Enzyme design. Sequence first.
Site, PDB file in Angstrom:
ATOM      1  N   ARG A  65      68.978  33.847  18.811  1.00 26.57           N
ATOM      2  CA  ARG A  65      69.423  32.465  18.962  1.00 26.57           C
ATOM      3  C   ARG A  65      68.869  31.859  20.258  1.00 26.57           C
ATOM      4  NH1 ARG A  65      72.894  29.579  15.821  1.00 26.57           N
ATOM      5  NH2 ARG A  65      71.563  30.624  14.279  1.00 26.57           N
ATOM      6  N   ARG A 122      79.668  13.813  26.478  1.00 23.61           N
ATOM      7  CA  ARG A 122      80.964  13.455  26.987  1.00 23.61           C
ATOM      8  C   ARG A 122      81.574  12.465  26.009  1.00 23.61           C
ATOM      9  NH1 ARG A 122      86.112  12.465  27.970  1.00 23.61           N
ATOM     10  NH2 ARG A 122      86.638  12.998  30.138  1.00 23.61           N
ATOM     11  N   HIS A 176      80.480  28.372   4.036  1.00 23.53           N
ATOM     12  CA  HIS A 176      79.833  27.873   5.240  1.00 23.53           C
ATOM     13  C   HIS A 176      80.367  26.484   5.564  1.00 23.53           C
ATOM     14  CE1 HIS A 176      76.517  26.938   8.087  1.00 23.53           C
ATOM     15  NE2 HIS A 176      76.557  28.242   8.266  1.00 23.53           N
ATOM     16  N   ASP A 229      75.270  36.438   6.810  1.00 23.60           N
ATOM     17  CA  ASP A 229      76.082  37.559   7.273  1.00 23.60           C
ATOM     18  C   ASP A 229      76.566  38.479   6.145  1.00 23.60           C
ATOM     19  OD1 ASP A 229      76.054  36.642   9.999  1.00 23.60           O
ATOM     20  OD2 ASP A 229      77.656  35.208   9.443  1.00 23.60           O
ATOM     21  N   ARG A 287      68.443  32.360   4.547  1.00 22.01           N
ATOM     22  CA  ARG A 287      68.480  33.525   5.410  1.00 22.01           C
ATOM     23  C   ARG A 287      69.007  34.753   4.665  1.00 22.01           C
ATOM     24  NH1 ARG A 287      71.892  31.434  10.383  1.00 22.01           N
ATOM     25  NH2 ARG A 287      73.131  30.649   8.636  1.00 22.01           N
ATOM     26  N   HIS A 325      82.318  32.783  14.357  1.00 22.62           N
ATOM     27  CA  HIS A 325      80.902  32.493  14.515  1.00 22.62           C
ATOM     28  C   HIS A 325      80.165  33.816  14.322  1.00 22.62           C
ATOM     29  CE1 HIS A 325      77.449  30.148  16.781  1.00 22.62           C
ATOM     30  NE2 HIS A 325      77.285  30.233  15.488  1.00 22.62           N
TER      31      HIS A 325
END
Lengths: 434, 434, 434, 108
Positions: A399, A419, A318, A373, A327, A272
């Site tokens: 973030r 859940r 990605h 990145d 970005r 990540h």
Amino acid sequence: STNLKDILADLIPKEQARIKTFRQQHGKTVVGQITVDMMYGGMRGMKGLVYETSVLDPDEGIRFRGFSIPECQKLLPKAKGGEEPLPEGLFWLLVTGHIPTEEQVSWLSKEWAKRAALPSHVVTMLDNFPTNLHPMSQLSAAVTALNSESNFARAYAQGISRTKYWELIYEDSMDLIAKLPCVAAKIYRNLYREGSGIGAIDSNLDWSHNFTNMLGYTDHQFTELTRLYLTIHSDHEGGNVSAHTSHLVGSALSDPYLSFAAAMNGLAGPLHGLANQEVLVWLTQLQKEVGKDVSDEKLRDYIWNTLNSGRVVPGYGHAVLRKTDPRYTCQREFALKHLPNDPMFKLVAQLYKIVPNVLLEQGKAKNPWPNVDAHSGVLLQYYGMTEMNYYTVLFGVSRALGVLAQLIWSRALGFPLERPKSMSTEGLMKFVDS
Amino acid sequence: STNLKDILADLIPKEQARIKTFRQQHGKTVVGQITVDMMYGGMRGMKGLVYETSVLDPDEGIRFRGFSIPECQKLLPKAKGGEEPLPEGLFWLLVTGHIPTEEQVSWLSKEWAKRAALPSHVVTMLDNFPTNLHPMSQLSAAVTALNSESNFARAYAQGISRTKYWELIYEDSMDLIAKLPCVAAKIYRNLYREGSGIGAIDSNLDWSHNFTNMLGYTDHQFTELTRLYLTIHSDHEGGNVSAHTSHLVGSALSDPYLSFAAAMNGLAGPLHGLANQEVLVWLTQLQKEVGKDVSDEKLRDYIWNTLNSGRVVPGYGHAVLRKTDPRYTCQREFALKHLPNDPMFKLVAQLYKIVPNVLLEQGKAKNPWPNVDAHSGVLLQYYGMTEMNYYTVLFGVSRALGVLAQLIWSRALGFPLERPKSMSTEGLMKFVDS
Amino acid sequence: STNLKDILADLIPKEQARIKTFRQQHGKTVVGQITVDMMYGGMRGMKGLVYETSVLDPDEGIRFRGFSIPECQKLLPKAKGGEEPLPEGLFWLLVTGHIPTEEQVSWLSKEWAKRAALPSHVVTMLDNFPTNLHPMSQLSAAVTALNSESNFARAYAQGISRTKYWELIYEDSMDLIAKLPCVAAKIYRNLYREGSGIGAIDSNLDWSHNFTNMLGYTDHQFTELTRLYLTIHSDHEGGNVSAHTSHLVGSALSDPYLSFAAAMNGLAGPLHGLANQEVLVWLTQLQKEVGKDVSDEKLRDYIWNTLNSGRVVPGYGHAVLRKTDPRYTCQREFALKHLPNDPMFKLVAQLYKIVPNVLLEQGKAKNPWPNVDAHSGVLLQYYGMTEMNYYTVLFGVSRALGVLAQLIWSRALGFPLERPKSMSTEGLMKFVDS
Amino acid sequence: RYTCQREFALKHLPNDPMFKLVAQLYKIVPNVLLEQGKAKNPWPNVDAHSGVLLQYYGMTEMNYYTVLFGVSRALGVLAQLIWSRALGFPLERPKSMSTEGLMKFVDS
């Protein structure tokens, strides 16, 4: 008017109503199937959660409440001396669905400046952490320790209506966003400036500018970089590890502090938030393996061998993006109008023209294009920010904007415990048979 | 000579092959759908992930590698002058799928004794925490800071093969499990015993007894309660918030400390693990506004005041269980053996007869039956552990066993990054219209 | 084993065996009660018959051999240029219980192309019909007079074993399905296309395409609509009147032509297949009374009148459906893909948002949600199919697929004479006292 | 407009062989075009069907056909031209860029 809480209060009933009707008429609609492969493959392709603040289109990249990054660059208020969008105004957009006015942004900068405050136990803890404790671990632990300040936790302990969760989640999220640059800058200064005095908050300066001041930087252009950086790493829909973590933990009514800290433990994961660094260490090596200058022939050649060793080019590909990340694009625009003749940046660009054609021909890419990145490391390094282990901390502070904007909405809309049902291999084989 | 790492080494290649073959034949098989309602409703009944160590049947409750709690109570080894199952053996079972021998458990007890040792920075941090930082926060924070000791983080930086990931997770998981009572007991002593320092490890004692020794308790039946408590809280499939958080964060290749600390942030949520604290707050409150033994209509009143205030009844309901939790029944079994007449236990029993008919008539509960959190607190209270704000820490210590057992397997099996797709309401409204 | 008939031959013994055993175990198992009310109220709620091809869940809607309509839209073969499932593929599913491969559907298209022919005597009959004989009457009469071609009828006369009925029923059912578009298109052209020559079958085209050609339509989109329409109207469990009629008549060993024609006399009933038309007449008026542009406000007004009038909103409610009909849904999706700005569609679309909540308040309707007939006419009208009396003929051609698929099975499985007991009011009053 | 012309053929010349050929192409060309891909729309336009109608009534001079289109399209374009001037619509004058210029403008 200017009070964001009041604007938000007005929006929630509307959105409550929109969803009630939607689910009434369309609750039982099938939106997707679940295969065995998906269950093994990390829910890849599964439509799993509603996340309101942003949506990632495979082809076109991230939209913040409908707006592409370029649209944000133009519409969102800037600092007076400024070209880049203030993160204040992005947060406002995520929260309201609406582009803020200059006054509204002005208001929010001052709101944040006033809430910026650490309690002594957190200051002490940070000051006592050893130097071999990673900055993301210091951030995580520190934000967890900040939950002593949680309005929502206290208010829940005393009992409160479900209908009012959002108001205290709002105040806590505002407090945390406010405080984060103070935590992040204390970590930098402790680690990389031998513990020098992080310094003041200027109540008339914007959030990014107080942050760059506290880090010990002055270049207005670095402040402009930080404005863009905090803006564009703010949110990336609900399915990325950090956003999902915050949503999952938040759905048990853990407070924003705990929800965010869990998210930071996700962000700290190599797959990540530690990519920006992998990239820079790979770029660095590469410029010391084929020299500083390299022609498009000899670079193309390095990339093909790289791939033949059974190794991927970092910062490309990605989970969901199927085209160039907007970005990356915006960072490139910044680079070529601000530091076009930087050596490291020249390499990044040189890979931009060559790596996409490769990968395609290899086939195993799906996304042969760059992600954020691929570009971010070289920019930070250019302005003096050489400490690579700290890079994810910047990603974290950013973030918080998206994940806390959504957390406020999740609780306003009464989203329940996340859940799902799990299965073992043994069980899944049996189910398949029956 | 026993070594769990060697058994694992044997077992892993067999399961890898099996899952490869299974996916080869059934990978494309549909196992369920996704509805709008599911997306809005925290993935309820969506089959989202593979999780090997335990499976929850809605009808029958939890099985650990196929074995029920009653089966584990009979089959799992025990302390010599003891009746309850050793949590060491459950871990063995979760990890290997095999019931352990007395010898294997003895080895595991010895292994966790030997790796029990805290670094001075974590000692420093805990000793300096204020009394109003919640035990769960201290636990999560301390575990995040232990990641300085992580072998996985260290090896991953150095480019270790993916085939070695499980061994590193194993080593970190064993260390953390070993360390956990040390952290938990320091928190206990610091908050509630003026920081006494009694807390050593006897190398010939089991993990639970070493824990109760460090907590400052002496009663043999508290130690037995602790053994059972830690055994039954250990795992509850992968779709509960804490297990799923661990799974999600670890899928990013965050190390076991970061994955566990995030899990604890989720476990600390009121709708999750913190319910075991909230139950006893809610009991204390009802006793203050009642006698010690109230009528059935007066209990119905108190419950109704809770529900009409937009609050939940703590310890009641479940996302997946559609009857009484066996972890509840098993705790009932313990109380009726050891403390059948305790006043708070009569109340807990009393509520069992009342709460489920309410809730059904309120309508906002698919499941009106109690979960494990309805019952844990009263057993603890009986033995003098009255500090309700500490109760989720014990849960956390137990839940390490399950989540870390799986984490070893997740890494052993090469499970990828968990990254579902999200949508906005607006985006969903348009997707259902095309 | 490739022919549909051979695949079917292989499946039949398995199913005989499976029913024998079930009846052996559970034949005397009571599955329902019969009240006086149910006897006066047309068997409402009574579980009267075994019908293999499709099952209607009250909440979820129709399933064809287990598969939802959304699944059929994904799984059944399309025309090479197409989006919408081919009714061929649906018939194959109904008959075998298996999703066909592409080649299987191709085979079936050619199979129905070869068998598509009418005897002169039936052509004379249709060409001699007057323009005031309703199309459903022309259809029923023509199919009844086709029974001169029944293999089953003549084989039964010469004497044949019980075990063999199904084979001949198969051949007659395949022949009738192939012939039905020819009959239906001759009716249309004689009534509305001035007896234009209906034209030839193209043996490379699928059934629906040859149909829309023979009707004199060209828009590939109408062909797609027709493919979708003939797929979703195919079957709706066995208790609908047309299906029940086919079953009941067939149980006397009346041939498929007789069985189907009798089913069309039921489908022609206003409370069954003539509903599409009432909806469209009603909407037409409504657009006239409230104009072609109307407000949610004023429309909701118009609904409340028509209820206080004592009259019912047509195309809403149903004998067994208790939720929105997936047959409505899939027509909705088609409209808002292909004609979202048709006035008549947008009105139907406005009704979807308002009428639901209104039928609820009034309390009287058990099912407040639209059924298939709410949507079908605006689509047909949009593609220029304006002869409202003909609409039910399309429904008839579709429904042949389902009832003939089951008829084959009913005879394969030796289902006997459908012959319940009746009572008079006099006798039922007597019975109850005894 | 294609469908409308098909309607007119099937009423007045349903059996003409050229109409039949246009009609068989309808079943074939869209699938071939989709396979080549290229075109986002493999479906016919008005120009696919207009000429085979004319041919039928004896207007075989295919080089004249676009003149009939011209005469028709006067109605649309002049109806709007009236309105463009009634409403004071100004000079249509977009900006152009060169590839060079567009390469730069994307890099600034």
